[PDB]
Amino acid sequence: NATEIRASVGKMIDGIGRFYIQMCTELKLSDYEGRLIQNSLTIERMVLSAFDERRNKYLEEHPSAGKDPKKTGGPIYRRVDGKWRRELILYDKEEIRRIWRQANNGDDATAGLTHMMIWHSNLNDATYQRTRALVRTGMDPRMCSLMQGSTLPRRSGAAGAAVKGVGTMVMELIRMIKRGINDRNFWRGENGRRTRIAYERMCNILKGKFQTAAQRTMVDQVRESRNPGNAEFEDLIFLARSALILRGSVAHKSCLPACVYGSAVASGYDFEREGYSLVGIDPFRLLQNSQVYSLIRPNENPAHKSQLVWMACHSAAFEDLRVSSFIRGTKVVPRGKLSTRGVQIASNENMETMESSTLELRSRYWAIRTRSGGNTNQQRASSGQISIQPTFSVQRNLPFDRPTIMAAFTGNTEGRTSDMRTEIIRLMESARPEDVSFQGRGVFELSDEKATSPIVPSFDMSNEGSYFFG
Amino acid sequence: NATEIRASVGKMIDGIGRFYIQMCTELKLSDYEGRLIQNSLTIERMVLSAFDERRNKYLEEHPSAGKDPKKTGGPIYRRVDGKWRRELILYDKEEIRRIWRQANNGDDATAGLTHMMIWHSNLNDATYQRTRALVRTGMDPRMCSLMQGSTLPRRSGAAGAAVKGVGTMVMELIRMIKRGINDRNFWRGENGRRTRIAYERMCNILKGKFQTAAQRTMVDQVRESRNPGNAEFEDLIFLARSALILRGSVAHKSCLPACVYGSAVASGYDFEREGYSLVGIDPFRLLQNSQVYSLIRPNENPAHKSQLVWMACHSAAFEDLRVSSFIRGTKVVPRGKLSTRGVQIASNENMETMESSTLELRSRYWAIRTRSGGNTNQQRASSGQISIQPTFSVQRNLPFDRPTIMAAFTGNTEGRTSDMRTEIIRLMESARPEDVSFQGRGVFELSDEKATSPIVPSFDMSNEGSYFFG
Amino acid sequence: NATEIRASVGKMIDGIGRFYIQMCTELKLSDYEGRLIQNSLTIERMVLSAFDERRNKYLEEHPSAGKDPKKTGGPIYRRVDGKWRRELILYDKEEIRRIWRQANNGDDATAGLTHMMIWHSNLNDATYQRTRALVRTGMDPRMCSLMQGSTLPRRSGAAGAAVKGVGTMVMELIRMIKRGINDRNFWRGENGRRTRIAYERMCNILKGKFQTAAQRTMVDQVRESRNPGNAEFEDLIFLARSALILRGSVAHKSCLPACVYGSAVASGYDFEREGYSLVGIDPFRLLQNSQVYSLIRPNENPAHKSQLVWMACHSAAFEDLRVSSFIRGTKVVPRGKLSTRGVQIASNENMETMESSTLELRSRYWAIRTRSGGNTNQQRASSGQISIQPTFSVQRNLPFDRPTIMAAFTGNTEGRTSDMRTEIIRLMESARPEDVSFQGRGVFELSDEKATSPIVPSFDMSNEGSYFFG
RNA sequence: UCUCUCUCUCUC
RNA sequence: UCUCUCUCUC
């Protein structure tokens, strides 16, 4: 059933919106100041710093960074008669802990935490990607496309684990491998056992993320190494560059600004009654009647800022620019010529130059965002019946495909990673930049609610550039 | 997290400083005597000898060099009413081993030991470059800029592996290749196993140090030779010659003399609380308020000696003279016209001519020392995405940059080294000596603590000479 | 490390000394008979006839030369109450081989074979220059200074190949290419395959011994010729004419008379304990208290013979007469006015004519025979830093000397040998006969052991002639 | 080398 | 070939 999930997510976002309402009440902010992204951003880093129970425990025993008992940051932006001023107001964690506890009807609301931290990961991926760490581990900077959910720490649950990219897991596992290579950390002690456990948890997350059997089997065999040394490093680099084309089925969770939920809840649009969804039309129509104000530099233009905000909201920074333009209806400028900077404001920037203005989030069309892969993999390896089920009692042979059943069970088990790298190479050669994917699905219009009739897009606009970076 | 590494480095430097305080207590030296470079050098080389297990174990089975059961060296210099005296005082290994034992709260302090070996590597690289071994191996002494950490023994760990450079690894590999050519050391004995293990580990370190893909793949094809003969000899020479321009980001650890650390520790500046960094402003901020004395010959210029010792402390002997002078604030004299000699003093030179004086270490500016390479390599090979991820479920093509996809995989595996020499010489031809590097970075002022605003240098002083040697 | 090398050196020279002692044992010779250079010469020639496995294997299948089953030569001289007698005593190979086996504790002592062959090469080069070979090859007899180690056979190892001079290598290359011109030996048979491996190895030695890179390139381009004809003949000729001034650092190994080692070992001076070297003070310190007797014709000058024996022992046949006179302390007579003959005695000369007399070997000073070249080549082509190592991350250009790095790679590969001949000619024009050498090295006094202080010689005796030949 | 291998972010 | 052309080095 899907009604229960819809009711749960509706209750969750209703609690989130009511917490936004109460923060607006408590902060004594104006109507316009309650529609600013910066305030929600700072408040949500406060949120994560209050539920980072692991870091709370680590910092209680580590009283450093000067005045840091329980309070961090808090750069609240306020308006005086047109001009803007930032105040470093410090809030302790504990009162906000109870205000959450009262905001979710006595519950902890950790799922909402996962969605906000994922949405921060989405905005981080949209704004800046780290080739710095990517080459710190030595991996080439060609794979910036697989840094989805990179900023997400381990503390998130399964829902958070679903949206993290393959490359994020590759980076996280290489960090552990390099740490275990630097020092003899895999001893029979509890630390070794726990890092072992986290390792297989991250690995079965990985093998769940993939779709084709060959990469799942080679991930299975990578596990067989009890002592991760140097060979596994290139083994999993080969895994990553294979996932470049044999991409993993990674979800795209549609989270929206802290305010958008608050404005919707304040108007009385209860999500429990009519139901809510995270993949369907819902986050699209809530943005159809949402007003958002933002802060812009004297050199920054708002036109690219609105598009970057739409990137951050819908996590489409790693998608084709042409498709995003089609749903937008306007051309989406790649990051090469974006005359803008990061959304977050540096702590040293002056305030006389800063100017606030609206953001455009209206889109002409809407589309479903499933956690599936391109149809090209199914074209390379088709599907269908593998055996037959006897129905009538008639003397006959029972057909069964031996060369497929034996290959599924791998009667002669693979010896190392290179033998499967051979099929990786032949699949890559079979792959083409022409194979059309997502057959049977299309882009839909706003006026339709039940997914009745789509329109098939068709682009012949040469080589405008389907690459957000470079 | 960076707090844990900061605490660890602060702890081990505090241990080193309080060991130096213990040495100053036990040696019964005056206040000026503990501000001498020479006595710190003597005690520090003594520590190197005491903690070097391999040479020791080679020595108790080899009772040679006359008086050598367990005591070596020890030329302690003492000021006698203005004059100086040198005494050859001999110390046991176990006593000072245990003095370290409580000098670090029961730990081995391997990281501190690596710090001392690295600081020795910097002093040797600043004073004398080993053209002699280069010509011995037939290797051109034009490339002394590849001799980072040549005096380092192989006992240094991963932290020590970070600092030892590409050309030094070429030299040590050439040594082992010459040894294996002289005699058949490649048999199936345990010696052959340890040789191949060391050889593959050192090749892994090499492939870690390089940046461009072509050199990495050529090195990966280097160790395919199970029986290294003569071809890999010129292969490695050409590796060094190509790494001349495509340099590897090895390391430039800013190690400081034990006297400076001891003076800071004695004053009560505990490093654990406020933190320590070896790469940022921190190793710099101790030096503008540091007093250092040293002995000088009646012909040596103290002004040159201060510049040379600041070079050795900051390991800037292979850095360009223009920027080194800009950061220092005064012109730096190249090795050609230095009216000074090595900071180490000969054991046979007379006692009368030595004169002590203060060493100038204060510098006008500061800069961060990143372990990276010039931007010119990224100019030759640009940056950007290679793959895309489907965010919306739309029936569309998945753009893949196929010709670079083969390039990463090398579908047609390289036949030999020569095909790689071809395009690497092509890249060398594409290189220009006017390529500005390190974009987006600059030199900051001492009043800056958080790296808020740098100033970009601009050198138009003709051809003063960006070559410390020659 | 050098301790193991000195220990091994002491080991095999101690074995050789004990072998000579036991020769004195079962030869039933007197004390004076054990101090005769020619007895050592004859015994050691019988030894080489015993240890020439290739020559033996060529010999048993060819039973010629009358009484030659296993016994060759053996002209032993004995004193009969003042007079002299010569007897042709024949010994087998196997018992001598077994005595060597028992003399080096069951080892083959191939290093001793190499050293004895090197001593023979120095003796023959000092005595007679085979200008007949030069005229047969057509190479002019003014190049006899490049005849170092001509008598050496191919069977010598890497140490034996080290002393072999450039001219001798050119000679066997001319011989082999002439043989390849006479008949079609370059066919696909195994003989041609061993031919090409030998030719390539000799070319590797050729590129090894020189110092300047342009000749490396020229000799490498000589080697690529799959069919060496008359052009490569001329190429090697020009290589010799270039190597006259661009001398290769071949070797100057100082091997000495077996009688001297036997006398030293018999006295109880163990070389393994105190260490021994073939380049340092050791060969100098043993000869100051060594007595050697030799046979002299009724016309031969004993004063000339002592000097010739000392020069042959120290391998100064191609050195400077003036420097030899300085190191010896007395004037060295050139070959033009030597009133002596070859050390070895002809088999037909009568026994009544020659008389025994002492040989003077003591020298006033001692020096070091380094395996390097004159400083003039480094004056023509200097040394220094060519590339810059970025230490501090600063927005700057990273200089690299393009006109030198490109010249190192030779981006436009050399067309033929003539283009390199052109730069050889211009370097010859830049060459001068007044280029001083030993800038920092000098001749030392005997009383010093640890290489403390030199005296720089100054020769102003006009034009006595620094030419041992002519 | 998590005190910055490039597109810049106080955010660990 | 560790006792060392090269700018010093126990």
Side-chain angles (χ1 to χ4, degrees), chain A residues 127-129 131-132 135 335 342 344:
Chain A
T127 61
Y128 177 75
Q129 62 84 30
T131 61
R132 300 174 176 179
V135 185
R335 215 213 74 67
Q344 291 179 157

Short mmCIF file of all heavy atoms in Angstrom, two decimals, chain A residues 127-129 131-132 135 335 342 344, chain D residues 2 4-11:
data_model
loop_
_atom_site.label_atom_id
_atom_site.label_comp_id
_atom_site.label_asym_id
_atom_site.label_seq_id
_atom_site.Cartn_x
_atom_site.Cartn_y
_atom_site.Cartn_z
N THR A 127 26.33 23.49 -6.06
CA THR A 127 27.23 24.64 -6.04
C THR A 127 28.68 24.25 -6.30
O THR A 127 29.28 24.67 -7.30
CB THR A 127 27.10 25.39 -4.71
OG1 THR A 127 27.48 24.51 -3.63
CG2 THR A 127 25.68 25.88 -4.50
N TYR A 128 29.27 23.44 -5.42
CA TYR A 128 30.68 23.12 -5.51
C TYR A 128 30.92 21.63 -5.34
O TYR A 128 30.40 21.00 -4.41
CB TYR A 128 31.49 23.89 -4.45
CG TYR A 128 32.96 23.53 -4.44
CD1 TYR A 128 33.81 24.00 -5.43
CD2 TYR A 128 33.49 22.72 -3.45
CE1 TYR A 128 35.16 23.68 -5.43
CE2 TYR A 128 34.84 22.39 -3.44
CZ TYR A 128 35.66 22.88 -4.43
OH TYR A 128 37.00 22.55 -4.43
N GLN A 129 31.75 21.07 -6.22
CA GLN A 129 32.19 19.68 -6.14
C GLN A 129 33.69 19.65 -5.90
O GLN A 129 34.43 20.49 -6.41
CB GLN A 129 31.80 18.93 -7.42
CG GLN A 129 32.45 19.45 -8.70
CD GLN A 129 33.84 18.91 -8.94
OE1 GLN A 129 34.17 17.80 -8.54
NE2 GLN A 129 34.67 19.71 -9.61
N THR A 131 37.00 18.19 -6.54
CA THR A 131 38.11 17.46 -7.13
C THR A 131 39.33 17.47 -6.21
O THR A 131 40.25 16.68 -6.41
CB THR A 131 38.50 18.03 -8.49
OG1 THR A 131 38.91 19.39 -8.34
CG2 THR A 131 37.33 17.96 -9.45
N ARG A 132 39.34 18.36 -5.21
CA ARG A 132 40.43 18.40 -4.24
C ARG A 132 40.61 17.06 -3.55
O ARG A 132 41.69 16.46 -3.58
CB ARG A 132 40.16 19.51 -3.22
CG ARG A 132 40.04 20.90 -3.80
CD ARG A 132 39.62 21.90 -2.74
NE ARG A 132 39.60 23.27 -3.25
CZ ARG A 132 39.25 24.33 -2.54
NH1 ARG A 132 38.90 24.23 -1.27
NH2 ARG A 132 39.26 25.53 -3.13
N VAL A 135 41.34 14.03 -6.01
CA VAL A 135 42.74 13.83 -6.38
C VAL A 135 43.61 13.63 -5.14
O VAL A 135 44.73 13.13 -5.24
CB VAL A 135 43.22 15.02 -7.24
CG1 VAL A 135 44.63 14.79 -7.75
CG2 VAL A 135 42.26 15.22 -8.41
N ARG A 335 27.76 25.75 -15.92
CA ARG A 335 28.60 26.38 -14.91
C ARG A 335 29.82 27.07 -15.49
O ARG A 335 30.50 27.81 -14.77
CB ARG A 335 29.04 25.35 -13.87
CG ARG A 335 29.15 25.92 -12.46
CD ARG A 335 30.25 25.24 -11.68
NE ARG A 335 31.57 25.68 -12.12
CZ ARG A 335 32.06 26.90 -11.97
NH1 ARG A 335 31.38 27.84 -11.32
NH2 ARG A 335 33.25 27.20 -12.47
N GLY A 342 28.74 31.12 -4.97
CA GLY A 342 27.98 30.24 -4.09
C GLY A 342 26.84 30.96 -3.40
O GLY A 342 26.89 32.16 -3.14
N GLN A 344 25.71 30.52 -0.32
CA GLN A 344 26.09 30.93 1.03
C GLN A 344 27.01 32.14 0.97
O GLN A 344 27.83 32.29 0.06
CB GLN A 344 26.77 29.78 1.76
CG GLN A 344 25.84 28.63 2.10
CD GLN A 344 26.56 27.49 2.80
OE1 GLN A 344 25.94 26.70 3.51
NE2 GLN A 344 27.87 27.41 2.60
P C D 2 46.35 13.26 5.85
OP1 C D 2 47.33 12.58 6.74
OP2 C D 2 45.80 12.53 4.68
"O5'" C D 2 45.14 13.75 6.76
"C5'" C D 2 43.82 13.85 6.23
"C4'" C D 2 43.71 14.99 5.25
"O4'" C D 2 42.36 15.02 4.70
"C3'" C D 2 43.91 16.39 5.82
"O3'" C D 2 45.27 16.74 5.94
"C2'" C D 2 43.14 17.27 4.83
"O2'" C D 2 43.91 17.49 3.66
"C1'" C D 2 41.97 16.36 4.46
P C D 4 46.20 21.02 2.82
OP1 C D 4 44.81 21.51 2.95
OP2 C D 4 46.47 19.56 2.78
"O5'" C D 4 46.74 21.66 1.46
"C5'" C D 4 46.30 21.20 0.19
"C4'" C D 4 44.95 21.76 -0.17
"O4'" C D 4 44.64 22.91 0.67
"C3'" C D 4 44.78 22.30 -1.58
"O3'" C D 4 44.57 21.27 -2.54
"C2'" C D 4 43.60 23.25 -1.44
"O2'" C D 4 42.38 22.53 -1.49
"C1'" C D 4 43.78 23.79 -0.02
P U D 5 45.82 20.46 -3.14
OP1 U D 5 45.80 19.09 -2.56
OP2 U D 5 47.03 21.30 -3.01
"O5'" U D 5 45.48 20.33 -4.69
"C5'" U D 5 45.50 21.47 -5.54
"C4'" U D 5 45.27 21.10 -6.99
"O4'" U D 5 46.35 20.24 -7.43
"C3'" U D 5 43.97 20.34 -7.25
"O3'" U D 5 43.44 20.72 -8.52
"C2'" U D 5 44.43 18.89 -7.30
"O2'" U D 5 43.60 18.05 -8.07
"C1'" U D 5 45.82 19.02 -7.92
P C D 6 41.86 20.65 -8.77
OP1 C D 6 41.31 19.54 -7.95
OP2 C D 6 41.63 20.65 -10.24
"O5'" C D 6 41.32 22.01 -8.16
"C5'" C D 6 39.92 22.27 -8.05
"C4'" C D 6 39.48 23.40 -8.94
"O4'" C D 6 40.23 24.59 -8.59
"C3'" C D 6 39.71 23.17 -10.43
"O3'" C D 6 38.68 23.81 -11.18
"C2'" C D 6 41.05 23.85 -10.68
"O2'" C D 6 41.25 24.28 -12.01
"C1'" C D 6 41.00 25.02 -9.70
P U D 7 37.36 23.00 -11.60
OP1 U D 7 37.40 21.68 -10.92
OP2 U D 7 37.23 23.06 -13.08
"O5'" U D 7 36.17 23.85 -10.96
"C5'" U D 7 35.84 23.72 -9.58
"C4'" U D 7 35.95 25.04 -8.86
"O4'" U D 7 37.23 25.66 -9.17
"C3'" U D 7 34.88 26.08 -9.20
"O3'" U D 7 34.57 26.84 -8.04
"C2'" U D 7 35.59 26.98 -10.21
"O2'" U D 7 35.07 28.29 -10.31
"C1'" U D 7 37.02 26.97 -9.67
P C D 8 33.08 27.41 -7.81
OP1 C D 8 32.17 26.25 -7.62
OP2 C D 8 32.80 28.39 -8.89
"O5'" C D 8 33.18 28.20 -6.43
"C5'" C D 8 33.23 27.50 -5.20
"C4'" C D 8 34.48 27.84 -4.42
"O4'" C D 8 35.65 27.57 -5.22
"C3'" C D 8 34.64 29.30 -4.02
"O3'" C D 8 33.88 29.66 -2.88
"C2'" C D 8 36.15 29.42 -3.82
"O2'" C D 8 36.52 28.89 -2.56
"C1'" C D 8 36.68 28.49 -4.91
P U D 9 32.83 30.87 -2.97
OP1 U D 9 31.50 30.30 -3.33
OP2 U D 9 33.42 31.94 -3.81
"O5'" U D 9 32.74 31.41 -1.47
"C5'" U D 9 33.51 30.82 -0.44
"C4'" U D 9 32.72 29.78 0.31
"O4'" U D 9 32.55 28.60 -0.51
"C3'" U D 9 33.35 29.25 1.59
"O3'" U D 9 33.18 30.12 2.69
"C2'" U D 9 32.67 27.90 1.76
"O2'" U D 9 31.37 28.05 2.31
"C1'" U D 9 32.53 27.44 0.30
P C D 10 34.45 30.73 3.45
OP1 C D 10 34.03 31.99 4.11
OP2 C D 10 35.59 30.74 2.50
"O5'" C D 10 34.77 29.66 4.59
"C5'" C D 10 35.68 29.96 5.64
"C4'" C D 10 35.03 29.79 6.99
"O4'" C D 10 33.91 30.70 7.12
"C3'" C D 10 34.42 28.42 7.26
"O3'" C D 10 35.37 27.45 7.65
"C2'" C D 10 33.38 28.73 8.33
"O2'" C D 10 34.00 28.87 9.60
"C1'" C D 10 32.88 30.10 7.88
P U D 11 35.45 26.03 6.90
OP1 U D 11 36.61 25.28 7.44
OP2 U D 11 35.36 26.29 5.44
"O5'" U D 11 34.11 25.28 7.34
"C5'" U D 11 33.81 25.10 8.72
"C4'" U D 11 32.32 24.97 8.95
"O4'" U D 11 31.62 25.96 8.15
"C3'" U D 11 31.69 23.65 8.54
"O3'" U D 11 31.87 22.59 9.47
"C2'" U D 11 30.23 24.04 8.32
"O2'" U D 11 29.55 24.16 9.56
"C1'" U D 11 30.38 25.43 7.71
#
